[PDB]
Amino acid sequence: SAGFVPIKQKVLVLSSRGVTYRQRHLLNDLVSMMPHSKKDSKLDSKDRLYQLNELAELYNCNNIFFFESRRREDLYLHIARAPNGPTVKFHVENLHTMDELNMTGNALKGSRPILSFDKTFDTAPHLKVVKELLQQTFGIPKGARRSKPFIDRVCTLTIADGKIWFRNYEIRENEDKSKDPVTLIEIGPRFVMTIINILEGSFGGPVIYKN
Amino acid sequence: EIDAGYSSDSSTEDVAPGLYNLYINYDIDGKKITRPATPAALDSLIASIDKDKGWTGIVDPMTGKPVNLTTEELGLLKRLAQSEIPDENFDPYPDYDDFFTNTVRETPLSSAPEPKRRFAPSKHEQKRILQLAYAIRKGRI
Amino acid sequence: ANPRQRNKQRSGKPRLTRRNANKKAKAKIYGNFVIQQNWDKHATLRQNYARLGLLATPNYVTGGVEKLYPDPTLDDVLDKEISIAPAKTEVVRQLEEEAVKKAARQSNKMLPLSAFEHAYIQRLINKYGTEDFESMAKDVKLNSKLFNGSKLKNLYIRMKA
Amino acid sequence: AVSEKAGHQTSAESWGTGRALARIPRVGGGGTHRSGQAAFGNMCRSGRMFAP
Amino acid sequence: EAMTLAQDIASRRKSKADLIDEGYNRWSFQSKEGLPDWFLDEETTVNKPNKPITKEAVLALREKMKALNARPIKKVLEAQGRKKMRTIKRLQRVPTLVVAKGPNKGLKSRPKGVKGKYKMVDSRMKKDLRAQKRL
Amino acid sequence: GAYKYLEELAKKKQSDVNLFLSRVRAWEYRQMNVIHRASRPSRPDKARRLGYKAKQGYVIYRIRVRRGRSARCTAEERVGRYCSNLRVLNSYWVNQDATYKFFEVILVDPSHKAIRRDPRINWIVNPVHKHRESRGLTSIGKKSRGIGKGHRFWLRHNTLSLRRYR
Amino acid sequence: VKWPEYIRLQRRRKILNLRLKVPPAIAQFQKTLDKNTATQVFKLLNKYRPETAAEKKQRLVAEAEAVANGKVSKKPYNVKYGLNHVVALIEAKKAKLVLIASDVDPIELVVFLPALCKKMGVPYAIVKNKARLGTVIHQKTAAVLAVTEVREEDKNELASIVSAVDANFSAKYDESRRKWGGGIMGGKTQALLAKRAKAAAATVRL
Amino acid sequence: LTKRQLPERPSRRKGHLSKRTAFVRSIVREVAGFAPYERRVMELIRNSQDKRARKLAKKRLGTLKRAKGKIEELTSVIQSSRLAH
Amino acid sequence: INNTVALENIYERIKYPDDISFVENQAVTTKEPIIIENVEDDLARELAFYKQGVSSVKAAFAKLREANVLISRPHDYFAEMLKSDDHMEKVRQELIKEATAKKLSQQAKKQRELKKFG
Amino acid sequence: YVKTWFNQPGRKLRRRQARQTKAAKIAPRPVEAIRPAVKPPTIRYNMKVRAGRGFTLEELKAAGVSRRVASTIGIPVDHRRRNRSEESLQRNVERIKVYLAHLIVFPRKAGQPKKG
RNA sequence: AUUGGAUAUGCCAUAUAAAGCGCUUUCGAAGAGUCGAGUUGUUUGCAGCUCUAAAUGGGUGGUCAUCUAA
RNA sequence: UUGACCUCAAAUCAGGUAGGACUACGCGCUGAACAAUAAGCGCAGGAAAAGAAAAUAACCAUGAUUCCCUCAGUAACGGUGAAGCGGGAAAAGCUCAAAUUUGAAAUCUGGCAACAUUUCUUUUGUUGUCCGAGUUGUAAUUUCAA
């Protein structure tokens, strides 16, 4: 039939040709965070993105992550709801990966994380739709394969000077505890998110928001 | 919508056994699952003494017991490792299928116009004839 | 200082001396006779070309030129015909007249027919007159070479003169 | 200019320390008056000039 | 080769359905049913696809090939003992100051009446020695 | 012409016809020497698009090289050493198996009059083309050493250029 | 005993192509035109042999003398040869009869020919030996021969031959050509390999 | 400046499919047969395992567009075979 | 272009239901609009992100205690970590390097006064 | 490695003699071929005019010169360049036309068989 | 003494030939174990290995431009 | 029986051809310790290699290669370190595969024979004739600019 064991939200991950070493690390780092993602090989078309719908329908992944690297410098991330839905293009800045020295955070691979959204996401309709789409992706649905039962990390998304700041943190159990011992440590995923355009269709259709 | 499901042949699955402590820590929603008691030391010693047919030496993370190939899995390994068709009844020699030449194309393949050389006497020979006539005039032939 | 150079230093066999290098000696003119007769071997080729009335290059010059004395809208032009160019000097005038007299001598480009060509077009003419070159072409028996009307014309004019 | 190889075409290394000899490289081998003589130095006969 | 395939089947790492599909290749369609021995022998030694091998499967074969009497009490004690006593018997089997003066001046190699490890001194290096000590 | 069919058929290298022929010919080539003379090209369409003519002075040699440099580059250099009086024109893959990749090398005799008098192949007689395969000047050699036109493909950087008026 | 290596290669190749399963497009070349019809085909072919180089030279000199001293011809008639030329003739639907050699060494040269002739509605037959075809056109070998035009005298001879090739080559076989060839096994060999197979299946699996 | 309409160069005509080239490939497809993966893919299509067939073609070939072209090719072969059979 | 009405319309089309229990979703909208004007001042930004995190976590923990979901990861759990243990050991060597460098610095600062007053 | 320039005046003279040797051979015709006028390809240099490689096929046809006779009389052909505007066309068509007006082409000795 | 490219001129010249331009109610073939994908080495290029194409296709840049490999 | 053909051998068979040396510069391969380096291995020529865009660009566009100057110590990459443009030197373009000559293999090596020719009795051809090569494709014709 259509599928067995229907998990609520599944993600399809593709990197276009021309992604750098750092950009590939971000994709692998992101894929490790979300176990409901299905990594795939490079897409030959830098312009014919309506094939991602056919990949998604085949793979039963309703959320597409397309990592577009143009001119070998500018990294863009396309997040869309695979059938129809809003396709929102973002620009990535200030990449920091797991292997970077400063970060020491540590969370269960696939453990369902707590999502925190800035209240500014509820101000604008486009900022709302981005929040709802981001929630439906990062929030690991129950029963997802490779997921862990307990909770060990929190993902924070905040809008500052129009740029979405994404920070991943790990909860620790402070020895004294007492006042809420969140004591979160930066996991390592650190980048600056910049919405560029939003399309009413799946990797296509007329633009509905322009930066 | 596409339901975000999992087809029965998806390469992603839960519980991936590996080679050889037992990985009986917790389950989904976080509950310790009971450790299966260690097997009778007699029975474990027997299995070690005489390895089962298709002894893989693989334990699933949940149960400490080893995983051993069944008869059908042993057959599949037999065909795959000997490089034959992994299907017991698959025809590798189907009868010739003329899905294209089962009918006659009425027209010639080419629409190019017919040249006039094919209707006029040959020019290669007329050139040769004039060269021969020259050699006869000059006494060469 | 080489073993191969010390070899002939101590040898008795004389060095294969050739005397060919004389700088400042410009290449003598072969090719055109008129240019050769008016070429002064001392001057440079730019000086020689300018004195003769010729352009050494039809493109800009990539540097300063010598100053010896204190010097005192598509359609209209795409359709226009540039009215030749004057012959400044005597040598250019000599070359122009030589070219024209040569062209006049080599001007009769039209050939007579051979024995076979004459009989070929005569037989075709004696049946289809001298205007229906289309019908002569389509004649399969007499036009065995399958000449077209344009080639059967070229035979007819060549027979007239 | 001088030859870029003049003063290098010999084979010589310093005989070391503790042998009561100036530690300038000396020509190896034997049987010729050059053997044992110093080389590779502005101060040395048949050596390299300073800053060729 | 067979162990790596068998391990992949049992460990579920590679899906069984994907293994079957991967079994329809250029080599499985070259059937060996009925071919002569002069042909089949050189086909196996030459035209045999080289599948990868994993270290885990190599250990499994060594475990299978481990006989019940591979390492008994003697083959672990006296066999270890003979190697130990061989190493012991092997083990039991297993500078001079020269002043550059008089005849020893101006030397280049081992001087007369000097053997083994040796060092040369000429009294010029005493000035350098005191300098190095002060360093 | 039949060369269009041969060129379309050579694209289906694992079809029943081509897989069967590969088995029989690979077995045949292994019975022969590692380098043997080929009486004719196995792929006449492939040979002629690479410069081969069915005229005296053109030679096809078959060689097998072990898999696991480019095997095509190795094939040309070993065949060029085997026939040291010829000029390696080009080479093409003909067959392969688990152990061996099989190639046919096209060579030209520069001392033959049919080659010295043919204006389309005279260039190879000229002594600048001695051992093109040894200097990387064949089609596979050019591709191996990165020669190519584009952006995908030393001394002027390691040298200090001191002019007179500096 | 010691056969020479090239003789062993020839004989092993003979048996190997018998034992191996042969794809239908290559197995069709093991079924050839019968001897009576091939003899009648070659009787018609031998009336249309191209002129030898010596005969061609004699005719052209005869015309050259007339031109030199004092001086309309009919179109020639002959069998058509050359692989590229015949393929163009089939694709142009000018061929009345195609005669394919049964032993073209690179079989890919003519492996597509029977199907191409089938697609174009050209009568064709697979005839024994490239050398018989070669002798017709004065060559050593001919991969294929084509009849496109005969004289009005021989229209009936060609028509009768085309009918015989239809009945004795295409009406016959047909189902035979669609089947994989090979697998031909000797009487005692099939029993022997059965002994090898049962012994192998017992414990020789690894 | 004033723009001009340039025609197409002969080199840009490349990639166009010829009627003879279409024919020759159809002939060769029938005569040669099919690859082991093509036989496996057509079996999956006949068994109506379209999703598994597309996954295999993509895995074998490497890209989705190559997989889609092969599947469409093999599917039309299945129809063509059934029309004659 | 910033079409609010359709953009709000698609919100109801992809509206994640509000009635869903938290444990199904695990996303919180902080009641406090954390405003950090000096975005150039990164140090103040981490504090704002920290305070928004711990409040978000505290609300999440309260809603999950009634959900009866084991928040804590027990000490016995040995599941695979998002970070490889191999580079974790590198991060561990990295941290001691900063520790000993800092420790050597304060010791050296001590010896500056020690030698003067020694 | 140090590259010196002591052969700079020598290289200057050797190139002058090569022009002299070329003129010694082709004596009346110019030592250089006529180059077209092209506009450099960028926003920094497109206001200038420099020398191109050769004249386009459309330029030669409008000037009446066939692509076969152009090389004979010293007019280079650039089969890669094209005229996207009529200004490039008119600029170089008139360049060819001026060149033709200033050109003296010497006749050639031809073969003329006795019969037809 | 030996050569080079022209010039004049003689004889010979197989032209029933061969070209350019210009017209179309006719046609127009274009290189495969290669590209590519996965993966492992060397430094995007290249090499090995497994897999293995297409036909306004394919490559490369930015729907467009440009180019036409093996 | 006779004979075609394929494949494979042999000959102090007719006639050719390869090796080794030099190695400044040139093209491949291999390659360290401290550098597309040295050493090692292979192969050339008077130059080599490269070369007539699966090239740049984003313009009012350029137009094979090479080299010089500049770009520029710039972009990028994290000290390493370009390229397009721009200025100059020199300039030249092309041949195949894929087409039925099919009213005519029109193509070519070699033998023998004459006849010329020569840096040259030493070189280089032409004409004739014969045997072969070649239709599993040699000429002419076409190469996308068409």
Side-chain angles (χ1 to χ4, degrees), chain F residues 94-161:
Chain F
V94 292
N95 198 7
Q96 70 177 12
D97 66 58
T99 307
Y100 294 113
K101 277 184 160 185
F102 294 90
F103 305 95
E104 277 180 346
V105 179
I106 303 171
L107 302 102
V108 173
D109 190 16
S111 300
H112 205 267
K113 291 299 162 46
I115 304 296
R116 298 172 78 87
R117 286 161 196 172
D118 176 37
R120 294 186 171 82
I121 196 76
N122 277 119
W123 60 267
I124 207 159
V125 183
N126 299 321
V128 83
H129 297 113
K130 293 166 180 168
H131 288 123
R132 318 161 62 244
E133 91 282 355
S134 179
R135 290 175 285 140
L137 310 166
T138 43
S139 185
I140 200 59
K142 283 214 177 189
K143 186 197 182 185
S144 275
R145 70 182 171 114
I147 303 313
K149 193 187 284 287
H151 58 82
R152 301 174 293 175
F153 309 95
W154 181 77
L155 199 56
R156 282 138 201 75
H157 181 37
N158 290 106
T159 194
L160 185 55
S161 172

Side-chain angles (χ1 to χ4, degrees), chain C residues 23 45 72 82 84-85 90 96 107 119 126 137 147 150:
Chain C
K23 292 303 183 195
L45 77 96
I82 317 303
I84 203 46
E90 59 301 302
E96 271 188 330
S107 50
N126 299 344
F147 291 157
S150 77

Side-chain angles (χ1 to χ4, degrees), chain A residues 22-71:
Chain A
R22 191 174 281 152
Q23 299 165 350
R24 271 192 291 118
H25 280 100
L26 169 74
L27 180 144
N28 308 331
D29 294 20
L30 269 174
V31 167
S32 68
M33 300 192 3
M34 29 184 197
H36 62 308
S37 73
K38 183 71 176 187
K39 190 174 179 176
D40 186 301
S41 76
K42 293 173 180 164
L43 185 91
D44 45 347
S45 293
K46 299 182 184 181
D47 36 2
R48 311 174 183 174
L49 276 303
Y50 40 82
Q51 311 320 4
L52 272 297
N53 299 335
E54 297 303 330
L55 279 162
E57 188 271 333
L58 172 84
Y59 274 95
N60 285 320
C61 305
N62 70 307
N63 310 314
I64 307 164
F65 271 49
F66 193 63
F67 278 81
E68 195 284 326
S69 191
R70 179 53 89 83
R71 295 189 173 172

Side-chain angles (χ1 to χ4, degrees), chain F residues 54-77:
Chain F
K55 77 153 75 184
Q56 284 155 343
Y58 284 84
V59 179
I60 308 281
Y61 257 79
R62 206 170 288 119
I63 180 174
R64 66 170 168 272
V65 299
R66 289 162 168 269
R67 316 168 70 164
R69 316 256 290 136
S70 196
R72 185 153 163 235
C73 204
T74 298
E76 289 178 336
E77 289 209 87

